[PDB]
């Protein structure tokens, strides 16, 4: 599973991507997992302050994943 991290997510967790194993069902399962790795991780992937796309399409924290699934975590932005 290509999970990619963009913008502030990337900057916070220090990696643009981590080829992981396909052991995750969904997106809200992944997020949880990855958030537990560290406070840096938790802040970066903090629920509410995050957006997720599965395979180039944006999804809710319930879409599911599979080997060959690219998952991208990145911040929403409401400033301007």
């Amino acid at each position: 599973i290509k999970v990619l991290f963009f913008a502030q997510v990337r900057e916070l967790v220090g990696t643009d991507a981590t080829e992981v194993a396909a052991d995750f069902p969904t997106v809200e399962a992944l997020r949880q997992h990855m958030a537990a790795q560290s406070d840096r991780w938790a802040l970066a992937l903090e629920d509410g302050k995050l957006l997720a796309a599965v395979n180039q399409t944006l999804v809710s924290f319930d879409h599911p994943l599979t080997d060959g699934d690219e998952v991208a975590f990145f911040p929403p932005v409401t400033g301007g």
Partner: protein
């Protein structure tokens, strides 16, 4: 619309673009665009909507110019600190293009007021900084079927979406439902604001293809651009 001779000269570089021509220029001249937020995004976008010849701009913001804004809101200046952003912007905008009509509205509007106001324009640019007004704008735009060109920027991240509110197209809540001071680098606003101006012009003139159904995300830190597709959420409160 008809263009004067002086206008045709001013707008020559657009007029000679292929599928744009006089008609496209005329279309801009006849448009009424509402720009909500004359902060960073608004300044960046309005400047080119103005220069480009969008004939009628309504500028809506409740806030005044502060010194901190001057790092990125380039229509404003030290001399306009304390003035309502819509006034400082209007003055700058009229100098960028004295052929256009510019209507500043220094207010914080309610939904009833936005409904009237949104309906009175051909297109709305959302250049605000908070999801409450963004959702309000999306609600009014959806209701009236007035396309919304939505831009956002913070830090080193920008995003743009065009909502044309067609059948089957997601609305902004389709997006905002997916989520629940910070700095902002100056040029970021330029990129996203100019993209808003571009998509706006494209919509107003029916030129090219709008960035609807996707979030265009610009990661300035790495200079990358990702386009994530946006799908309609079945139970979107607004468009569901």
């Amino acid at each position: 619309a008809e263009l004067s001779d002086q206008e045709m000269l001013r707008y020559n570089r657009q007029i000679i673009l292929r599928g744009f021509d006089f008609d496209g220029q005329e279309a801009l001249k006849d448009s009424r665009v509402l720009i909500v937020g004359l902060g960073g995004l608004g300044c960046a976008a309005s400047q080119y909507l103005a220069s480009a010849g969008v004939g009628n701009l309504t500028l809506l913001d409740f806030d005044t110019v502060s010194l901190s804004n001057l790092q990125r809101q380039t229509l404003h200046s030290d001399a306009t600190v304390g003035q309502p952003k819509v006034e400082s912007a209007r003055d700058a905008l009229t100098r960028i293009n004295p052929h256009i009509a510019i209507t500043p509205v220094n207010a914080l509007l309610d939904d009833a007021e936005l409904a009237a106001l949104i309906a009175e324009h051909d297109l709305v640019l959302d250049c605000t900084d908070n999801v409450a007004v963004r959702n309000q704008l999306n609600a009014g735009c959806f209701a009236a079927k007035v396309p919304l060109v939505s831009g956002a920027a913070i830090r080193m991240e920008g995003q743009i979406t065009v909502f044309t509110y067609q059948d089957g197209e997601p609305c902004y809540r389709c997006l905002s439902r997916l989520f629940g001071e910070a700095g902002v680098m100056a040029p970021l606003i330029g990129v996203i604001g100019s993209l808003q101006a571009m998509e706006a012009i494209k919509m107003l003139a029916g030129y090219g293809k709008p960035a609807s159904g996707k979030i265009v995300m610009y990661d300035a830190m790495t200079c990358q651009f990702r386009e994530m597709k946006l799908m309609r959420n079945p139970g979107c409160e607004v468009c569901g």
